Ligand binder design. Sequence first.
Ligand SMILES: CCCCCCCC/C=C\CCCCCCCC(=O)O
Ligand SMILES: *[C@@H]1O[C@H](CO)[C@@H](O)[C@H](O)[C@H]1NC(C)=O
Ligand SMILES: *[C@@H]1O[C@H](CO)[C@@H](O)[C@H](O)[C@H]1NC(C)=O
Ligand SMILES: *[C@@H]1O[C@H](CO)[C@@H](O)[C@H](O)[C@H]1NC(C)=O
Ligand SMILES: *[C@@H]1O[C@H](CO)[C@@H](O)[C@H](O)[C@H]1NC(C)=O
Ligand SMILES: *[C@@H]1O[C@H](CO)[C@@H](O)[C@H](O)[C@H]1NC(C)=O
Lengths: 205, 46, 204, 150, 150, 150, 150, 150, 150
Amino acid sequence: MNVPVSYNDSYDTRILFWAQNFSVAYGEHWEDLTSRTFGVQDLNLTGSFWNDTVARLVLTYDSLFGTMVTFKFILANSYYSVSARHWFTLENLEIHSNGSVAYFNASQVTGPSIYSFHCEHVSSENEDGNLLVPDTQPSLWQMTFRDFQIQAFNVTDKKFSYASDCAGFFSPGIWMGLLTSLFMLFIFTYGLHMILSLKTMDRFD
Amino acid sequence: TYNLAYKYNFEYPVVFNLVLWIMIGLALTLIVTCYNIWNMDPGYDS
Amino acid sequence: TGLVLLYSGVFVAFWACLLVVGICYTIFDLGFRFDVAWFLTETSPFMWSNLGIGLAISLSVVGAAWGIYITGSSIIGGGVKAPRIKTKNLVSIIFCEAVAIYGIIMAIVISNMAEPFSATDPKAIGHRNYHAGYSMFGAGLTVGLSNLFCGVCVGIVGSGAALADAQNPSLFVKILIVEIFGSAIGLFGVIVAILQTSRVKMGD
Amino acid sequence: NGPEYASFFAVMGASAAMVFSALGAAYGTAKSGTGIAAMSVMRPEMIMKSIIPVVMAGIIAIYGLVVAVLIANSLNDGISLYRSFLQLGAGLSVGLSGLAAGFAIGIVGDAGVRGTAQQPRLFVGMILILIFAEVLGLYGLIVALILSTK
Amino acid sequence: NGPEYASFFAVMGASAAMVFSALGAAYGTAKSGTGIAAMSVMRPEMIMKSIIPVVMAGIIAIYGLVVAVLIANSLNDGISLYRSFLQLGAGLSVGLSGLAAGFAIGIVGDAGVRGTAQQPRLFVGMILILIFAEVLGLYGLIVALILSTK
Amino acid sequence: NGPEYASFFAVMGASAAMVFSALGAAYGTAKSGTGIAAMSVMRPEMIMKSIIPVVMAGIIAIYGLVVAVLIANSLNDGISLYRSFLQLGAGLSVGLSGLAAGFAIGIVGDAGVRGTAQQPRLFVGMILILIFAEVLGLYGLIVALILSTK
Amino acid sequence: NGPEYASFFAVMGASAAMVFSALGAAYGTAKSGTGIAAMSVMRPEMIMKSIIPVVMAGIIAIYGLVVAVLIANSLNDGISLYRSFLQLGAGLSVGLSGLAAGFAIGIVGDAGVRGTAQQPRLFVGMILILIFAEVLGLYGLIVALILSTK
Amino acid sequence: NGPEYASFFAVMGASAAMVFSALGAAYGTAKSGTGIAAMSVMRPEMIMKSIIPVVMAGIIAIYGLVVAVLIANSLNDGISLYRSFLQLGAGLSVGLSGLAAGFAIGIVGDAGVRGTAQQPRLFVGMILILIFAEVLGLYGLIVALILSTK
Amino acid sequence: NGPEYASFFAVMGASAAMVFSALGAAYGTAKSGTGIAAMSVMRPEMIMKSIIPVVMAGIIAIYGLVVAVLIANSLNDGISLYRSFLQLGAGLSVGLSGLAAGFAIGIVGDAGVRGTAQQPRLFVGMILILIFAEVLGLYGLIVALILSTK
Ligand SMILES: CCCCCCCC/C=C\CCCCCCCC(=O)O
Ligand SMILES: *[C@@H]1O[C@H](CO)[C@@H](O)[C@H](O)[C@H]1NC(C)=O
Ligand SMILES: *[C@@H]1O[C@H](CO)[C@@H](O)[C@H](O)[C@H]1NC(C)=O
Ligand SMILES: *[C@@H]1O[C@H](CO)[C@@H](O)[C@H](O)[C@H]1NC(C)=O
Ligand SMILES: *[C@@H]1O[C@H](CO)[C@@H](O)[C@H](O)[C@H]1NC(C)=O
Ligand SMILES: *[C@@H]1O[C@H](CO)[C@@H](O)[C@H](O)[C@H]1NC(C)=O
């Protein structure tokens, strides 16, 4: 299987995307839209916009929960002053059912533009760490990525560049619990060091 | 469409510190003990 | 030194490996992975605040208890031959009891300004609210460690004034001037502690 | 304006200007005031004249307090990252140099009042060294004001 | 222009130029200051001649004060990353070499004034070694200046 | 041109060439300087003959000075990462070898001056050992030169 | 060519080959240097006879110098990562072996020359033990050379 | 073939086999070398016979030498990650076992020659214990070879 | 098959089985070897009967050698991560428990041969304690065996 790519009329490619599983859920039923995407090799992508600062991907499937339902990956590419770089960001996502719009937010899917984001689970159904949150919490549309890699605005040689993972040696919660524990371990080894030196007398009178 | 990324698992913050703070917590116990026994002040005259 | 060789070994091996981990983030390209912004913003403004409220009272009574046994061992030590010390020289104990008072007064001041909110996003939790986290942290450090250091200060001079009073009773009034300058460092911390949190307001 | 995390370093600059200068003022008064109560048994005449090494360490505290009021009042919500590093580098310049001026006053002021109790000719020399020990903190003051006020 | 956190290294240059010179000059004043009090009990004539280790250690503090002011007046929001490492490298250069010169002046200043109490012929040699320990701060000054003008 | 973080390591080469050589020269001056005062109580004639080991440690300081200026004149905005690494290794090679050479000078300078105070025949042998202690910094100098020329 | 970060490890091979060997050559010259001065008061005839641990410690210094020049001459911009990792391993194999061999010469050079003041027959045995301490640096060469020719 | 950073682990085995065995061979030479000089002042006849612990410590050095060349002969760019981990595990298992064997030779070699100055019967007993301490370095060799052949 | 970095933990099991075990055997040879030289000055008749703790400590290295060979025989490229972790815990449980056993034979072998010279009745009791001292390495064997069969 290969990626859905969007090549430009000018002699350079543009934004490309990959997953293993791609499942979208509506209400209770789970639909595996991964053979129609990567192995099918033909897709209806209406508007693959590019302006060198804002780009989109529309993926439409025509055979889903009832009707023709499209997914919209929305990326952006800004210049951040503090970091003096170009950082791409998956802005939100959109699913379009009967008229209605799903609006899944995806922060922590950001990257520094030259490289590519890559995550393991970009799933919905919030537990703690899921990158996709809806705008309304009792939402019906849910989606699941068992793999993930998107590059946008800086694609070269029709393939991905280095990865900017969601891997995270310390994500914030372990990095709060470590800063709490290793602070009060300085208190405990201080209280132990005073106790380890209260030595008794040698003789009595 | 090559240059697919390396697939780090999603529990990478957990597994990294579950190894690290155990192993340097176990090695710190191992050096403290091994020190205490390396010299132990015997009564060696007899 | 046997137990100090542990802390001297941990402090070396920790940094040493920070250095090798520091010249391997820059040298590849991976300085974008460092993100002191993601450290200061993502974690909590409750962690910085409630640590500083805890460090305000606790680190002040650490130096308050530290100041007692330095001179309280000197009271009972010099008081065996000269028992006239015990009533006159308890003011040195109160001068390291005021530094716990400055702690607990500032502790209930800093605890009243903490208020829960609902937002969870670093943009939804505004810069009025993250500054509320850091200011309660820094106020706890400047009233916690300052009352600690002046707690040792009035205790050390209080121990010396307890021992000169055993030799000559007319000396303790003159040496008591030094403990006033030592106790002024405690009030200097409480001034900065209420200035860092004068304009602050936590909540949403 | 500035980012959300920007206000962190200015608070640390206001703290470390006061915390480390408190440690200097504590050592400068404890280590020297140890020598005051010690010499007072054999010579109670200089018991009011030798209180001046513990007040040279007292000015080390008020060096740290002035820059603390400067930073804690210039601090506001949404300061730039450039302004906060200036106030962080201000407080480290005054507190950790006042820590040096606190150690230099305490070691000299303890030794000076022992030699003054043994020979009173040293008193005109002791206050000269305490001048040189205190201006270490004074140089830390004028670099903190030239950094925070930019 | 450059990134926003570029000014962090520059104010770390202005800070570390001051404190590491101050921590050195504190060691020069304190360690030699104990040498003044130990010798003056027996030889009260050599107290005004013997203060030259605490004065030559004071030149280390003004070596740091010059570079700390020169860096702080060269600061600007949005300085480039290349300009910022120059002032950071100049701050550690005058500081840690002034810190090393602060140790060397304090050691030979302490042992020197104990020797001049036992023999006045050492007073011509003591300033010779104290100069050689003082130029180490001067060598750090001229390379901190060659980094700051760039 | 090179990356933006490249010039950090080159100015770290300029700093570490100075502050580590100055730390070495400070140890050679201080550890031998106490030996001069311990000799001078009995043999004041060999005072000027004994300024040589603090002079031999002084050449270690200017060994790091010439390469620090050599790195600082070769600095530029946006140098290559290959060039900046060459000056970083040039800085550590002269400073840490100068720190070792300054450590070697101060040890034999301490015992050799104390040893020649009891017997003047050691003085020709002592200054021979100090030659071997100096060339350790000279070997580190010439590799710092050929690393800075590339 | 290679990656941009490639030159870092080969240059750290050039610096560690010098400063670790110089650290060994310092400890070989300093620990044996204090042994000469404590010996020479009783037996002043064996001065030039007893410089041979100091000279053989200096051979450890030129041991690091040869490998540092050979590594610094193979340095080029954009070399492969395999080539630089060889010269990093070539640097540690001569430096940390020269630090070990330099530690070996210093200890027996201290004990050996103190014994020759009491008995002259040790001198023909002490030079034999210093040879076995010398080949440890020589074994560091032939691994460092065979790592650099590849 | 393997990755670009694969060669880093194998050259670490080439260095650590020589570095750690040199530290063992140094401690076998240095710690036993002090025992020769303390023995020699009373018994000058047992000097050529007393060098037998410093020769066996030299055999520890060539145990690390043969595997360092054997690993460096097996070095190549584009080696697999499996081949490099064996040579790293081979290098640690002979150097750190040679450091252990050189520790044991240094301890009993020192105490053995201090004991044989008072009794010549100990010389056949001391050489028996040195053989058992020698095979510790030899046992590290046969695991280093069985890891490097595959 | 397994991942590319899988073989590192297994060869770490092959090296830690030899490094810690030879280090354990080193301490058992060194500490008891000092006890032999202190014993034989007074009692030369029992040195054949007294080198038994040197021999009992030597099996600790042989216990580590067996697991070092057994792990290196199961090594192939593409081992599973489960099979690689089993050999890592095989080497740690026979190396570090051998280091525990070498501590016991080292101390009891030291003090036991001190009392064996002054009283020959201890020889029945001394070797009885050395039985319980050696089985710590033997218990580490059969857990290293039962981890390696899987
Ligand atoms: C996963 C947790 C791993 C870390 C466990 C920490 C527990 C270690 C407990 C302390 C063991 C220290 C033994 C030292 C003995 C001291 C000798 C003595 O008191 O005489
Ligand atoms: C995800 O896709 C895989 C096919 O690659 C399939 O086997 C699996 O069942 C799917 N999971 C879900 C939850 O749909
Ligand atoms: C592709 O999808 C869009 C949905 O907006 C639809 O209008 C269009 O007709 C589709 N094209 C094809 C060829 O199916
Ligand atoms: C590029 O397209 C975006 C899409 O909305 C638009 O906002 C922007 O102004 C365009 N820029 C240019 C230069 O045309
Ligand atoms: C869209 O409408 C049709 C007809 O009402 C229905 O069958 C289908 O389920 C709807 N799709 C979704 C996703 O609700
Ligand atoms: C979520 O997405 C919506 C889409 O319009 C946006 O308005 C909102 O700011 C996002 N919120 C977060 C927390 O990302």
